[PDB]
Symmetry: D2
Subunit: 116 residues, 4 copies
Amino acid sequence: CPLMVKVLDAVRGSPAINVAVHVFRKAADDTWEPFASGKTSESGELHGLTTEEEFVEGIYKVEIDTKSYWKALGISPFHEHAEVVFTANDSGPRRYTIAALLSPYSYSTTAVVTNP
Amino acid sequence: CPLMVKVLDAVRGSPAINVAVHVFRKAADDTWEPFASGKTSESGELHGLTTEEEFVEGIYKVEIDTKSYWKALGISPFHEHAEVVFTANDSGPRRYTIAALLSPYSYSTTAVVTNP
Amino acid sequence: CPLMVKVLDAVRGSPAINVAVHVFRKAADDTWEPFASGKTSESGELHGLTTEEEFVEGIYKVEIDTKSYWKALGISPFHEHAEVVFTANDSGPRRYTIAALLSPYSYSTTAVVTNP
Amino acid sequence: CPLMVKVLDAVRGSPAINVAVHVFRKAADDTWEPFASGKTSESGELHGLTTEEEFVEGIYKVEIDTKSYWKALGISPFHEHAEVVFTANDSGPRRYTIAALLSPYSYSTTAVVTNP
Ligand SMILES: Cc1ccc(C)c(OCCCC(C)(C)C(=O)O)c1
Ligand SMILES: Cc1ccc(C)c(OCCCC(C)(C)C(=O)O)c1
Ligand code: NA
Ligand code: NA
């Protein structure tokens, strides 16, 4: 699994379950092309977005749909979503974990990048 | 001031100085139109972005050019830039402070929304 | 002002108002001795804690009574309190800002250390 | 595993490896008694601190030795350590994950609490 996303909830002290995630890759014409999407499991984790073959060099945007997550829980949050934009695989294939920690008026993100 | 941006550096323990910040407003056709921009001051702050009359309800995106910031300090960064995407809502308090805390592989953002 | 504390609320998107803050200095016998304390203002800030003459090099601990803060808002919190433990060093810049961002199961803190 | 600790590094985009962790439990006399300690693995994780039997009701302090971690990498950090202080197992046994994200002048912590 070359790209994985994990999301925690800072209000409940739990995984953030059923969070929609959309990944885009910047195209030659500088627009964002849809690349992969899915939703986090009971453990807050989203596996299986892509494959080593398809996950080529590029600029990627991981959009985490925080608003829909909070509204589904009955909360009115500040942000529309949380974005993480980065160049990937520029020095050969790596494995990326994108982690986010959510609050209604705040979020944090970090990346773990490892070499297989 | 209806909209203020403040950026801090978690590696140096300082304001993030001379960081470029672009604000966009979402247009009816869902494209992002330029709205305001500037560079953070010696205190990491960017004031004067807009006025009450110009800052109407809507979806806004604040793009912080973190990559240039780190490169100017000789640090290899992960992100292309940081985004903060939010709805401005007249019901709520009048003044928005968007704060961001920068690290090379991570970032945190929060909103401080208050009445004078 | 050589030492300032600022506290924000990630659930409400506001300053954290009326939060008790205790500062301790580490004594030669490794116990923590009271040094200064106060309550955050309506802007989430606590000024006037100490003076240049009193704030000598050493190890300090800033305790923020997060549990009382959340309970006063009717929110069930995880932590007993938040701590920030650091060395004051005269080599470095003169002014220390300790900032904390509070959620019920999480918190973030950073230091902004600058010269006037 | 009723108590686990995970630590990431925001500068390197990696697990924080070989981080010393000390856990204390508040005693009847209000002093902090040593409870368990260990260090994070190659994956940034610390398992095996305690057992369901020994991990009784109490106020616990998880001290993460961030200074020793950064100094071992040649960096002079701001904080002495990162503390997480909380009441545990007050409503029966739970499983706690304590996560931290480290930068030289900043850290973040969150907790995941689950019911077995
Ligand atoms: C303290 C903090 C700040 C910011 C973020 C994004 C955090 O993310 C959760 C990391 C979870 C992890 C370690 C990847 C895991 O579950 O194995 C944590
Ligand atoms: C601990 C932490 C984590 C993440 C962020 C974004 C933080 O914001 C900095 C707040 C600075 C403030 C209060 C807006 C000011 O200087 O006026 C703080
Ligand atoms: Na290349
Ligand atoms: Na009980």
